[PDB]
Amino acid sequence: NAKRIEGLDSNVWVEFTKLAADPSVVNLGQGFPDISPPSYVKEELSKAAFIDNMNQYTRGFGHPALVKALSCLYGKIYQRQIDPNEEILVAVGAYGSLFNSIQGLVDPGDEVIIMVPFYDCYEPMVRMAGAVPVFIPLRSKPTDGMKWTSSDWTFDPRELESKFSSKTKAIILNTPHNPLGKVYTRQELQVIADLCVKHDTLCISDEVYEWLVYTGHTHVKIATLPGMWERTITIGSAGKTFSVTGWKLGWSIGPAHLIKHLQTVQQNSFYTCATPLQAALAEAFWIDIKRMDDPECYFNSLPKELEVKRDRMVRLLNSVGLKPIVPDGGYFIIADVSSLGADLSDMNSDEPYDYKFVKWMTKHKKLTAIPVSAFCDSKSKPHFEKLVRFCFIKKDSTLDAAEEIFRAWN
Amino acid sequence: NAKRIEGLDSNVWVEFTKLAADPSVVNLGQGFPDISPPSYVKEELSKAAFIDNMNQYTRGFGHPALVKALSCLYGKIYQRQIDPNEEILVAVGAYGSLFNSIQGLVDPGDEVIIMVPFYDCYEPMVRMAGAVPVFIPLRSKPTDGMKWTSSDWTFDPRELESKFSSKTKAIILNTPHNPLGKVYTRQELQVIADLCVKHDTLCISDEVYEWLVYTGHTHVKIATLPGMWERTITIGSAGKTFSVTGWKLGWSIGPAHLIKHLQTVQQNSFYTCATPLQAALAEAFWIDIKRMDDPECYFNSLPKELEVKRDRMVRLLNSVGLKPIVPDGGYFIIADVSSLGADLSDMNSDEPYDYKFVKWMTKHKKLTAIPVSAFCDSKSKPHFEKLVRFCFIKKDSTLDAAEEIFRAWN
Numbered sequence A, B: 001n002a003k004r005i006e007g008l009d010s011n012v013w014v015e016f017t018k019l020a021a022d023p024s025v026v027n028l029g030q031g032f033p034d035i036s037p038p039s040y041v042k043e044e045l046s047k048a049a050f051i052d053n054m055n056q057y058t059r060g061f062g063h064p065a066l067v068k069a070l071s072c073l074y075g076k077i078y079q080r081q082i083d084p085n086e087e088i089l090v091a092v093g094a095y096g097s098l099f100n101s102i103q104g105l106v107d108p109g110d111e112v113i114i115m116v117p118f119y120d121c122y123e124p125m126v127r128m129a130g131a132v133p134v135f136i137p138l139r140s141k142p143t144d145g146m147k148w149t150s151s152d153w154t155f156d157p158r159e160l161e162s163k164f165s166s167k168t169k170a171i172i173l174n175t176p177h178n179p180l181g182k183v184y185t186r187q188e189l190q191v192i193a194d195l196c197v198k199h200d201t202l203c204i205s206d207e208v209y210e211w212l213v214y215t216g217h218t219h220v221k222i223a224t225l226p227g228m229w230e231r232t233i234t235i236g237s238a239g240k241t242f243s244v245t246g247w248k249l250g251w252s253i254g255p256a257h258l259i260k261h262l263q264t265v266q267q268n269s270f271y272t273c274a275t276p277l278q279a280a281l282a283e284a285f286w287i288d289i290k291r292m293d294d295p296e297c298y299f300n301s302l303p304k305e306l307e308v309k310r311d312r313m314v315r316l317l318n319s320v321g322l323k324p325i326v327p328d329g330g331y332f333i334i335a336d337v338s339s340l341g342a343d344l345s346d347m348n349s350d351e352p353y354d355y356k357f358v359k360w361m362t363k364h365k366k367l368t369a370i371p372v373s374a375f376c377d378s379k380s381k382p383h384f385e386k387l388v389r390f391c392f393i394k395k396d397s398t399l400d401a402a403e404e405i406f407r408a409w410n
C-alpha cells in the first residue's frame, strides 16, 4: 500500500455493512432515496440509450449539451455569464468534484479548515493530499423556548478567525449541511468570506443539497459574495438534483484559473464521464429550466414534497421522546437520543454512545439510522455521540412502516 | 496549482480537439467507434433506466451483479476462481483503473518502467504519484519478406533487464498494444515475468483490447504465468468489450492484498460508479458468457468483423504508398509515411514530423489520423516521428469515404 493512503483504509460506510442487511427492518440510514425519480429523467436515459453516439465518448470535461445547460441555470443563479468550457467541470459525482478540487489545489503541509460534524470524506481527501485538516465545531445557542432547529447551531467568528494562519489553503463549507441540515445565513457566510479575502485562501463549497430549502430559509452561495468568485469552487450533483443518486454526476463551477487545475486532475485520472447519463441529464435540466416559476419544476416541487416528510418525522420522533432538531434543508434529521431510557451494558465496547444506540435500535426496534459521531473528528465525538441521524427522502409506504415502529415503541 | 500536477496540464487529446472539428472530414484518428454497439447492450440500459433502484447508489467497488458476472467470465479465462468482492474493483474506465493502481501502489521516488510507444496517460499518471518513469523502446526486427506486422516489433531482453534496479516499484504492460497493435508472445511475457519475480516488483497490465486478436495470434495473460498472480493487476474495459466507449466502466483483476489498496483509493476519490450502466453491463456479460463457444458471442464476432476491416485498411494505405504495419490485435493501424516526402516544408513550427504530416493531410486530403509521437517521451520522438496511426472500428459507409479520399489522392 502506498504511503499517501496509509491509515485511510477504514471508510465509515464500508463499516455499515453491519445490520442493514436484514430484510425485516425499515432503513432510515443511508441517503438512499426510494421515491421514483421524475419519470422524464428515466425517459431521457432510455432515449439516450438508443442513439449510437450517445454511447461513445464525449468532451472530457463535460458533455457539450450538459455544460451548456449548467451554464444556463447557474448563470441565472449567479447573475453572471458562465463559460461552459472554462468555468465548469463535470466529475463522477460530487465526490469526484471534491477530490478534483483537493488534489488540484492543495499540497503537502497546507492546512484545510473543516467544520464538524462534516460529511466524512472531507478528512481523508484532505489527508490523502498531505494536508492538515483543521477542525472547528458547530455550537448550540439558546433555542426560542419553542422547538429545536438547525438555525440554533452556528460558529464563533473569533474561533474561526483563529484557525486561519498563513498555512491555510482552503476552508470546506457544506450548506445545506449534512448531517444537521443547517442552511448558512448571509451573515455566517460573510464571516467566511471576510477571512478568505483577508488570508487569500480558497473556499470549496459543497452545495449538493442546494434546492432542498424549507420555508423561512434561502440557499445563498458564497461564490456570489463580494470578492468570492475568484477563490471559490462550488459543487453540485445530479444525485441530489434529480433523485437519481446512482448516476454519480456532479460539477464544479468556478473561475478559470481554478477550474483548469481541476481539469488537469481529471484528464490524469478518469478523464471522461458517461455520455448516455450526461445526454439524458441535460434534457432533464432543460425541461425543468423552462418552468422555474412553476410549481411542477422539480426544483420547486421536491422541497415542497420533502417538507411534509420532514414534518412527519419531527412528530414521529417527538411521539416517542427522541428530541428532534428540525432541519432548515436537505433530507436528513438528527435527533437527540439521550433523554431516552436505556440499557447499553449489553455492549461494553466503548466505541461511541450513538453507535451503541444505533445497534440497539436495529436489534430491538427493527429500525436503523446513522450515529452522528461518524462525522466527527476523534476529539469532537464526545460532544455529538448522543446524536443520531435519520433520512426522510422516502416513499409513504416506507414512512408508514416507520410510523408503525414508532407507534409501537412503548 | 498543486505541485503534484506540475506540467501535467498539456494532454495530447486536448491538443487534437481542433483538428477534425470540420464536418466534411473523415476522422480516422480518435478511438471513437461508429459502428453500432450490440442491440442487447442498448436495450438493457433502457430496461435498467425504468427500474427505480438501479437509478440509486449501488456498491462502491462494483455492482454485485456485474462483479458476479466478471468473476464468472474471468474465472473461465484464468482457469481459477476469482473473488467477486476482494479480487475485483470496478472503476471509471480503464483510465480510472490505471489511476487506482498507481495511486494505491506507487510512491514518490519509485521507478516505473514503460515501453515506448505507450498509451499516453501512463507517463503523467506515474509522474503525479511522484514516481520516475523509466523508458525503453520497442525495436523492429527484419520482416518475413512479404509483410510488415506488429510481430516484427519486439523488445531487447538484456536492454529491458538493465532497466530494473532496486528502485523499480513496477512495470506497465499494454497488450494488445496501442498504438502498434502488438500481441505479446508467451516468451516476451516470460521475460517480463522472470524479471518481476527476480526484483520483487509489480506488473500492471492494460488488456482492454483482450478480445481483439486476429488469426494466428492469442491473447496470453501475464497474470497467469508462474509467480505472477501475487504481483499483477490486470485491467479491462467496458468501452472495448462492448463497443460502448461512452459508458466509461473498467475493472482491475488481481490478488486480494494488492486489490485492497486500489479500493482504498477509490473510496476516497469518487467512490461509486453509476448503477444503471453496471446493471446493464452485468446483463450483457450474461448474454455473452452463456454463449462463449459460438460465432455469435460478441467476444467472437467483433474480432471476426474487424479482421476484415483491418485488411481493407492495409490495402488502402498501400494504395497511396503508405507503408502499413499490420497489427496482431487492437483496432489501430500504424503506417510509415516517410516515403512520400510530403509538402511540408513550410509549416515552420518545432513540432515532430508526424504532427505536421497529419495537419497537412487534414487540410489537403480531408482525412485525420494520430501521430505516433504522441505516444512517445522526448528522447524517443525522433525514432518514431515518421509513423502515423489510423483507427478502423468504423462502419462500411465510413471506410467508403476514406476509400474515395485515397482513390483521388494522385
Ligand SMILES: Cc1ncc(COP(=O)(O)O)c(CN)c1O
Pocket (backbone or CB within 6 Å): A031, A092, A093, A094, A095, A096, A119, A174, A177, A178, A206, A208, A236, A237, A238, A239, A240, A245, A248, A249, A250
Ligand atoms: C454533503 C455531501 N457532499 C457530497 C456528497 C457526494 O455524493 P455524490 O458524489 O454521489 O454526488 C454527498 C452524499 N450524499 C453529500 O451528502
Ligand SMILES: Nc1ccccc1C(=O)C[C@H](N)C(=O)O
Pocket (backbone or CB within 6 Å): A013, A014, A029, A030, A031, A032, A178, B057, B058, B060, B271, B272
Ligand atoms: N456514504 C456512501 C458510501 C458509499 C455509497 C453511498 C454512500 C451514501 O449514499 C452516503 C449517503 N448520502 C449519506 O450521507 O448517508
Ligand SMILES: Nc1ccccc1C(=O)C[C@H](N)C(=O)O
Pocket (backbone or CB within 6 Å): A057, A058, A060, A271, A272, B013, B029, B030, B031, B032, B178, B245
Ligand atoms: N484519448 C481520449 C481522450 C479523451 C476522450 C476520449 C479519448 C479516446 O477515446 C482515446 C482513443 N481510444 C485513443 O486511444 O485513440
